[PDB]
């Protein structure tokens, strides 16, 4: 196990769980995607183009909301494009990501 290792009782290593439900061609979804990509974070996109079932699954987790996109971090609901950009503008997004 050669290398410069970091020790702080992590045990098994996980990182921020970031999810975004999208339509690929939605300009608001695209805008939210761009922000996340710029940050360089690892995340999961659920592109649900024309997928009615997945939308109902999304709405179940997002306060019944069916608007796109819907964003989650560590299983907490962040909201849509405006929401994440508002958090970033007030310096609240990076420590959720989480740095």
Swiss-Prot record:
<dbReference type="GO" id="GO:0015038">
    <property type="term" value="F:glutathione disulfide oxidoreductase activity"/>
</dbReference>
<protein>
    <recommendedName>
        <fullName>Probable glutaredoxin ssr2061</fullName>
    </recommendedName>
</protein>
<feature type="disulfide bond" description="Redox-active">
    <location>
        <begin position="26"/>
        <end position="29"/>
    </location>
</feature>
<dbReference type="InterPro" id="IPR002109">
    <property type="entry name" value="Glutaredoxin"/>
</dbReference>
<dbReference type="InterPro" id="IPR036249">
    <property type="entry name" value="Thioredoxin-like_sf"/>
</dbReference>
<keyword id="KW-0249">Electron transport</keyword>
<dbReference type="Pfam" id="PF00462">
    <property type="entry name" value="Glutaredoxin"/>
</dbReference>
<dbReference type="GO" id="GO:0034599">
    <property type="term" value="P:cellular response to oxidative stress"/>
</dbReference>
<dbReference type="InterPro" id="IPR011767">
    <property type="entry name" value="GLR_AS"/>
</dbReference>
<keyword id="KW-0676">Redox-active center</keyword>
<comment type="function">
    <text>Has a glutathione-disulfide oxidoreductase activity in the presence of NADPH and glutathione reductase. Reduces low molecular weight disulfides and proteins.</text>
</comment>
<dbReference type="GO" id="GO:0045454">
    <property type="term" value="P:cell redox homeostasis"/>
</dbReference>
<dbReference type="InterPro" id="IPR011900">
    <property type="entry name" value="GRX_bact"/>
</dbReference>
<dbReference type="InterPro" id="IPR004045">
    <property type="entry name" value="Glutathione_S-Trfase_N"/>
</dbReference>
<comment type="similarity">
    <text>Belongs to the glutaredoxin family.</text>
</comment>
<keyword id="KW-1015">Disulfide bond</keyword>
<keyword id="KW-0813">Transport</keyword>
<dbReference type="InterPro" id="IPR014025">
    <property type="entry name" value="Glutaredoxin_subgr"/>
</dbReference>
<dbReference type="GO" id="GO:0005737">
    <property type="term" value="C:cytoplasm"/>
</dbReference>
């Amino acid at each position: 196990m050669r290398g410069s290792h970091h020790h702080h009782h992590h045990g098994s290593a996980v990182s921020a769980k970031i999810e975004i439900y999208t339509w690929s061609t939605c300009p608001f979804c695209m805008r939210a995607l761009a922000l996340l990509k710029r940050k360089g974070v690892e995340f999961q996109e659920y592109c649900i183009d024309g997928d009615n079932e997945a939308r109902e699954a999304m709405a179940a987790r997002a306060n019944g909301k069916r608007s796109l996109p819907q964003i989650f971090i560590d299983d907490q609901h962040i909201g849509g494009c405006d929401d994440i950009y508002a958090l970033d503008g007030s310096g609240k997004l990076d420590p959720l990501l989480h740095s």
